[PDB]
Amino acid sequence: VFNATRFASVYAWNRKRSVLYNFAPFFAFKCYGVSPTKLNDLVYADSFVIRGNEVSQIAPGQTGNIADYNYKLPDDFTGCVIAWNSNKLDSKVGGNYNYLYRLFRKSNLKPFERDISTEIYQAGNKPCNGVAGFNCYFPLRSYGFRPTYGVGHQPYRVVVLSF
Amino acid sequence: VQLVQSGAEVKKPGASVKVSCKASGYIFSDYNIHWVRQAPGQGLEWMGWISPDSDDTNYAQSFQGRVTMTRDTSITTVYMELSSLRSDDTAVYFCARSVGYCSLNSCQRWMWFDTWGQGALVTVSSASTKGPSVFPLAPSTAALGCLVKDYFPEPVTVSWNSGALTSGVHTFPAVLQSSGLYSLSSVVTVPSSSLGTQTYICNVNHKPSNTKVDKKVEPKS
Amino acid sequence: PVLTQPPSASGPPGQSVSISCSGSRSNIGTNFVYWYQQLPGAAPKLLIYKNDQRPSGVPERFFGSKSGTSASLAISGLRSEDEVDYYCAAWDDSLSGHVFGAGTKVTVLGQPKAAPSVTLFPPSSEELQANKATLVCLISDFYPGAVTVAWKADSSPVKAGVETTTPSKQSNNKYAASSYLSLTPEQWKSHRSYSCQVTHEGSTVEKTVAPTE
């Protein structure tokens, strides 16, 4: 799960049913209920990629954009999340359009639930069955990655260890 | 960014094609290489793309089990294999670089072909090559020329007195007969007085068979 | 499920010309559409992307927009460069492959009418030993380049053995083509005379050849 060459987008994430400190330095290694001094004295694998601004959105019970539309943790949680840098692996010149996210949806999701659909969103009164012009937009939008981006826009590969 | 394709060669049906293009002046691993064909007469047509960091060769539904596409990342080339080519596949072929890079299927909304290499077309028909023959044409101003038939493959050039008389020289289009061969004509227009003191010699050539027959034309009285 | 569009649009210089492109459910109105300009006999390049955007170096006079399941492209200013073929390119999800248009030809709106010139070249003596007889007939200096060449043998028209070439582009804004004939060497003396004529602008030009020079 950690050394996979291909990582899926956040809207359609992978679900997969030792020592973890032999990797790169970690931007966000925090845990809830259990501590890293208690995990070694102690399972699902859900992984996706998140831009550097909203890495803090992956948290139990807080609102936002990716934490309300794509993947969000319930208020009660015992597992935790590991975030780590990926700039020379998944960012390259010209952009990386493999990593999508969903922006528009009818309502927020149930916990631990994913949605893969390209039904065109409706934001008005006239029913747009298949026309994504004005007042009707495509759900999935892509956010590329270039080496000219700053410290808050790198694609951070991330994974949660649900217990 | 610069993309160079190979030349055009003769391919008898049932044989394979060697079409490829290289990448120069930029990082080859961070850009997809789509292929686009174009038969003369109608619009463009899509083939498939190469992800130059893995082995992902997606094709169209129509030519899913027909084409063969192979990456050779050592000398930054992209090879392509079509065996048993048919008469409808006579087309010019382009390889193009798309901005960005994706390997999924629901990622092509932001993919357009930025730069294009020059095309390389393929051939058909069982004619391998035949030695061209130049035939005399008598006058009947004045007009005289020399006709060549059963030449293959294209192109074949004509030149009059090593290009000394290029005024009035018209390069007629080639013709395709029912036998599958080609015939070419080239004539020059001259006035009605200077014929016997100007021996007009048309020099023809054929590069693959390396045959170039220079022939005099005699007026008939 | 292919894109459809008019094959050719013509306009006078002074105002713009509009190119329309209509698509299916999975071609236009669910995904972006791009416009490609093809130089004659070369590699086409991007002219419109992202439905309102252009690369640097493209002049600020090319306009494109879409409203429903169809898209429109407008070109303002037509003097010496935009007389080329345009293509409507978009992504398809139903076929899961890139799809293109048929091809739009743009023509702007002083050449005088010219009568065609035809010379029926007699056969030579070298073809006698080759067991072949091909009659050569050339046409040139005619406008427009839309002609039909017919062969008349004695007292009846002939259809078998005709060869017709597409008119080509000259250096003086002129079109020219050529016509041949498959014939046995014995049949050359077997007829009274052979005729090569062409229908151009309502003018049929008659040339006759005789085996006795």
Side-chain angles (χ1 to χ4, degrees), chain A, chain B residues 1-177 179-193 195-197 199-211 213-215 217-219 221, chain C:
Chain A
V1 59
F2 272 69
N3 211 30
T5 61
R6 174 141 311 180
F7 267 75
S9 299
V10 60
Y11 78 107
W13 41 252
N14 189 359
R15 178 168 278 257
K16 188 75 172 46
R17 190 62 46 87
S18 88
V19 56
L20 283 72
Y21 281 102
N22 55 4
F23 281 74
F26 304 118
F27 164 71
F29 190 97
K30 67 191 294 183
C31 287
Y32 309 134
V34 73
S35 295
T37 61
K38 201 199 261 172
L39 173 58
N40 52 4
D41 307 341
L42 165 65
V43 178
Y44 301 94
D46 292 331
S47 69
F48 43 89
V49 287
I50 293 301
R51 202 199 297 170
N53 189 359
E54 68 275 16
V55 191
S56 296
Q57 288 198 152
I58 301 299
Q62 58 172 24
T63 61
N65 195 4
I66 315 298
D68 287 324
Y69 264 90
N70 296 295
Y71 187 84
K72 64 91 176 179
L73 272 299
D75 265 337
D76 46 351
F77 193 34
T78 179
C80 61
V81 65
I82 297 169
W84 60 92
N85 189 9
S86 48
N87 209 9
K88 54 169 71 174
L89 277 71
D90 299 78
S91 176
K92 35 202 170 180
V93 179
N96 205 332
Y97 289 159
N98 265 317
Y99 295 160
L100 277 296
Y101 67 95
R102 188 191 263 117
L103 192 73
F104 285 170
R105 207 177 184 264
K106 304 296 297 169
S107 62
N108 60 5
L109 283 72
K110 291 177 71 68
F112 279 52
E113 182 36 30
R114 59 172 140 173
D115 194 79
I116 305 104
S117 47
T118 61
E119 193 263 357
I120 296 94
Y121 196 59
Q122 210 275 348
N125 269 9
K126 38 172 54 183
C128 53
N129 55 5
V131 188
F134 182 76
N135 208 5
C136 290
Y137 292 165
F138 199 80
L140 294 174
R141 311 252 288 276
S142 66
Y143 61 114
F145 315 100
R146 328 181 177 275
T148 187
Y149 283 164
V151 297
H153 271 58
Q154 287 105 22
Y156 279 157
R157 304 232 287 264
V158 75
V159 62
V160 294
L161 258 61
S162 179
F163 280 107
Chain B
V1 61
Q2 283 82 237
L3 277 81
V4 184
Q5 286 193 175
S6 171
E9 299 78 17
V10 56
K11 276 76 69 178
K12 181 266 289 181
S16 179
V17 300
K18 300 289 94 175
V19 57
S20 88
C21 64
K22 320 204 175 201
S24 77
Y26 75 108
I27 297 89
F28 179 61
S29 183
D30 61 348
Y31 291 109
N32 288 119
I33 303 299
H34 290 245
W35 280 48
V36 176
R37 77 175 203 164
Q38 174 194 5
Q42 69 275 17
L44 264 53
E45 182 65 26
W46 186 71
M47 281 335 287
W49 78 85
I50 279 295
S51 60
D53 63 88
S54 67
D55 310 326
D56 189 358
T57 67
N58 290 106
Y59 317 120
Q61 307 281 79
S62 183
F63 292 164
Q64 184 59 255
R66 170 72 276 161
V67 310
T68 300
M69 185 180 288
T70 292
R71 171 156 154 243
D72 281 331
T73 181
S74 300
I75 310 170
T76 187
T77 57
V78 172
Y79 280 9
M80 187 66 204
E81 314 283 334
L82 276 296
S83 297
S84 74
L85 187 153
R86 312 193 65 265
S87 65
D88 52 335
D89 300 272
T90 72
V92 71
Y93 282 74
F94 304 105
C95 78
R97 166 192 85 95
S98 46
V99 286
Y101 156 76
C102 67
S103 158
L104 290 177
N105 214 327
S106 174
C107 68
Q108 283 309 100
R109 325 180 69 244
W110 310 266
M111 294 296 172
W112 38 267
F113 319 118
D114 196 15
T115 184
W116 294 59
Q118 70 275 17
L121 73 163
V122 300
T123 61
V124 73
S125 158
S126 167
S128 57
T129 187
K130 284 145 193 52
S133 295
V134 62
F135 291 166
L137 281 67
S140 180
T141 185
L144 74 164
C146 52
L147 162 68
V148 66
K149 291 189 244 149
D150 60 272
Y151 67 96
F152 194 78
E154 291 86 330
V156 159
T157 71
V158 292
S159 60
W160 284 92
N161 281 330
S162 73
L165 184 52
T166 180
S167 302
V169 178
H170 187 273
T171 52
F172 282 87
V175 69
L176 178 60
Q177 317 99 38
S179 63
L181 272 298
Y182 277 77
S183 295
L184 197 48
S185 280
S186 177
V187 69
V188 59
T189 305
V190 286
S192 185
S193 55
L195 271 299
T197 187
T199 304
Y200 312 101
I201 316 170
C202 49
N203 314 269
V204 300
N205 62 332
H206 177 263
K207 277 74 69 177
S209 82
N210 310 116
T211 305
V213 175
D214 308 323
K215 188 202 60 55
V217 190
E218 47 260 51
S221 60
Chain C
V2 71
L3 277 296
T4 185
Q5 65 183 177
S8 175
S10 310
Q15 67 264 13
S16 76
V17 67
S18 70
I19 313 300
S20 66
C21 182
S22 56
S24 293
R25 296 285 276 182
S26 159
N27 297 119
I28 318 294
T30 190
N31 267 329
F32 296 157
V33 63
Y34 315 126
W35 291 101
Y36 288 140
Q37 158 169 291
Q38 184 178 182
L39 193 152
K45 74 153 178 272
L46 174 69
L47 191 152
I48 301 299
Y49 80 106
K50 193 68 180 295
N51 296 321
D52 49 9
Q53 297 294 321
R54 270 147 309 156
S56 313
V58 166
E60 296 305 292
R61 65 193 169 100
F62 303 148
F63 187 36
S65 74
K66 69 174 187 69
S67 57
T69 178
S70 65
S72 177
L73 159 70
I75 309 287
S76 76
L78 303 173
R79 71 221 172 287
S80 297
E81 196 255 329
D82 313 328
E83 51 267 25
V84 288
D85 203 296
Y86 279 3
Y87 292 92
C88 187
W91 168 254
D92 189 358
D93 291 331
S94 280
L95 275 74
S96 87
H98 267 258
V99 298
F100 283 78
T104 307
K105 180 55 153 294
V106 176
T107 46
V108 299
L109 299 176
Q111 194 153 3
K113 182 184 161 170
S117 306
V118 56
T119 301
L120 194 45
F121 268 73
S124 184
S125 64
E126 186 52 285
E127 293 83 3
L128 294 174
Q129 301 94 22
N131 304 275
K132 277 210 201 69
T134 61
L135 270 297
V136 289
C137 188
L138 308 178
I139 193 66
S140 74
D141 209 14
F142 59 94
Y143 185 78
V147 288
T148 61
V149 177
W151 291 75
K152 292 285 286 294
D154 296 330
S155 74
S156 292
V158 294
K159 178 71 77 174
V162 65
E163 282 85 22
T164 306
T165 77
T166 299
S168 74
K169 187 56 209 81
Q170 289 193 31
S171 53
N172 59 336
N173 289 328
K174 200 53 71 178
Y175 293 99
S178 57
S179 183
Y180 284 63
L181 183 63
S182 68
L183 191 75
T184 50
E186 197 72 33
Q187 209 174 359
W188 166 254
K189 301 293 183 182
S190 180
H191 302 237
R192 295 180 175 89
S193 281
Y194 269 17
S195 167
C196 179
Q197 88 265 17
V198 64
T199 307
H200 173 259
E201 274 292 284
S203 161
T204 58
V205 287
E206 179 68 283
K207 291 301 184 65
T208 314
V209 66
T212 178
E213 175 173 346

